[PDB]
Design a protein around this nucleic acid. Sequence first.
DNA 1: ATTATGACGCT
DNA 2: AGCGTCAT
Length: 430
Amino acid sequence: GPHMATGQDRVVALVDMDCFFVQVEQRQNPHLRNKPCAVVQYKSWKGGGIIAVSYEARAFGVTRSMWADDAKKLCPDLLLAQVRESRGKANLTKYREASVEVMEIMSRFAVIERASIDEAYVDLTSAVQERLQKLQGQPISADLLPSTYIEGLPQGPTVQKEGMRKQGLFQWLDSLQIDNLTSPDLQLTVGAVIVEEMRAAIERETGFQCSAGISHNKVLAKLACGLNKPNRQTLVSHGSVPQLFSQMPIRKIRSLGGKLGASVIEILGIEYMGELTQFTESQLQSHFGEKNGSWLYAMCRGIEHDPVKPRQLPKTIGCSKNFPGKTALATREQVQWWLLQLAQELEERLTKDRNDNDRVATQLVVSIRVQGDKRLSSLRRCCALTRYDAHKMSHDAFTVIKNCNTSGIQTEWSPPLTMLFLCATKFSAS
DNA sequence: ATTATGACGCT
DNA sequence: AGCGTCAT
Ligand SMILES: Nc1nc2c(ncn2[C@H]2C[C@H](O)[C@@H](COP(=O)(O)OP(=O)(O)OP(=O)(O)O)O2)c(=O)[nH]1
Ligand SMILES: [Mg+2]
Ligand SMILES: [Mg+2]
């Protein structure tokens, strides 16, 4: 009863940029705006692999991981932008730099956790206390929430989507207790007002549109963000969780879309997140381990305690390239030339990072995949990263992998290499 | 021949 | 440390 934690202590937002790489290319090339378009890596094999898709193109069934030649069968007028190639490999610098633009804007409002190139969590708890102090119990106008959906509303006793959005928002605002500065629903609402402001700032200052979720923790904020894309934001209240989860496939919750989620389904004989509530915490721990079990017990009740980490910069800087089927590297000269290409991109990015961010990486991780191995990584070895020198890094990477060569000949490489990966890690301030 | 990352957990 | 999972 009165002691049962409800996980309503924080206001957390998740901001995800809509079809990010597409928007970066559409900003640069206005001929791509408001068109079905996609971003592709490479071109020779099946037209290149699609990694981002505009919402107009998604209406035709174009998806990520589709070959552009097949996408063109679904959408013959699909427009394509190609990722830049440098030193023989895909170079994502333009999108990393665009991401920095967005993350700096969001950092003006609150401390953010960079979760990916195009999404960040925001801890708005303190900003919400501030805005509530400034409001002085003044009600929140629907005008301040022009792109907000309230999940689960409207409910109870129009045939157009904006009309439904506004009915739901009206029902929500009508039920608000605006004189209770500690009401979680009011705090979420103020958080949504702030996120409207943040998203407006991102669009004004970059041209990019985004979606967002506002809830009491990261998992619900992420889930919420996905409910009304593109260019909209969604508030998921604590009270909305029983109905939301009652039909929510377990795999939709972040961390459960893989083997653990499949095992929850098969072991417990359930389909939906809400069905987890019928198990004790000890039962879930017995199947899925102490940490997963406690997390699932709380998560299916809408409660999650994982903090928004104050981290705007990536923890690692890496370069990787696959060498599929017959492009596999089978000679020493090959392996060395490509280690050097990867190392030269890494050196460029590391030098920029040291100048921008006052830090130096101290460990170089070298990962490879050999032909025939099913695992995405066949071997990981670390060595010291003591100088930002591409020839030195590529020589060191060769030194740490050179005994994987089964060939008795010194010039041949067997089994041939289908993937090279260099990653700089363990940053120290400088 | 799904590609290029990147975070985090396990032991 | 090296490997696995999950994300996309
Ligand atoms: N290189 C590479 N980049 C990827 C891959 N998957 C996604 N990305 C990039 C391109 C996307 O624009 C960007 C952000 O991914 P998201 O999952 O947020 O999707 P996106 O923003 O494209 O669309 P969304 O509106 O969020 O559904 O990450 C991939 O497999 N390889
Ligand atoms: Mg994202
Ligand atoms: Mg996506």
